[PDB]
Design a protein around this ligand. Sequence first.
Ligand code: HEM
Ligand code: NA
Length: 250
Amino acid sequence: MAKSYPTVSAEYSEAVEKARQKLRALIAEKSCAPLMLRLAWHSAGTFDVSSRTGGPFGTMKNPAELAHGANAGLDIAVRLLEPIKEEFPILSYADFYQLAGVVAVEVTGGPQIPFHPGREDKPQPPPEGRLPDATKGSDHLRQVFGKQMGLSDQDIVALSGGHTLGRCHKERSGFEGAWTSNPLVFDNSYFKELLSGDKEGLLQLPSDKALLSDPAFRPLVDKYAADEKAFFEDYKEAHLKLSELGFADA
Ligand code: HEM
Ligand code: NA
């Protein structure tokens, strides 16, 4: 009961649904779901509960947030979606980019994540530097996901499984390569590749590897590697919370 969702007009709700359908077509047709998940996650993951700044409030449209080092390449995502956004002026960018993240998981075979409309577009981006550093470990993950975002250790491990989609690019993050052999399929392969150790053709970041040595994260890796259904359930709950940080709080 931690949420009290706002009431939106019937027209707002109709625009959400029509935009959802257009996003499902575009994201599938252009094979860009991993980029769109990263767009939604980088939009939301800047929330800091202590100041209630950041979070999924549309600020990735702002060129100054697009210029953050961690957001290299997301300008492509923003531009690819703008022709659809122009057809739905009633929608906030905040809702629109979180809807894109939800659709990205759906169209790649993942769980159906609930979506509640009504986020406001806020004028100021968060400061740069809130998002997790791929070179750091478990203490840093708990500081970012836990002390800033308010998310649980389970959420950290489940959300790291978003790396079942897509890849790193040398000109964006500077890392290069995919975590899985099927980077357009949302499944639990990420955790299986982590457990098997490194292999030719695939990438693991130090932040991925921190999940394996931590005594609280590791049992969750084990669980998700063995049980895709449990991974999908926990991923769904964690993505929902992430997509609503700072939004509709009771
Ligand atoms: C746990 C800490 C995390 C770190 C350190 C991290 C870091 C990174 C880095 C360095 C890249 C490469 C970007 C590029 O070069 O294009 C990346 C890509 C990606 N990240 Fe994360 N990430 C984390 C968590 C997450 C979460 C929570 C999600 C969503 C649930 C996510 C989804 C993705 C996806 C889908 C890609 C591929 C993007 C593409 O293929 O264009 N990651 N991440
Ligand atoms: Na995959």
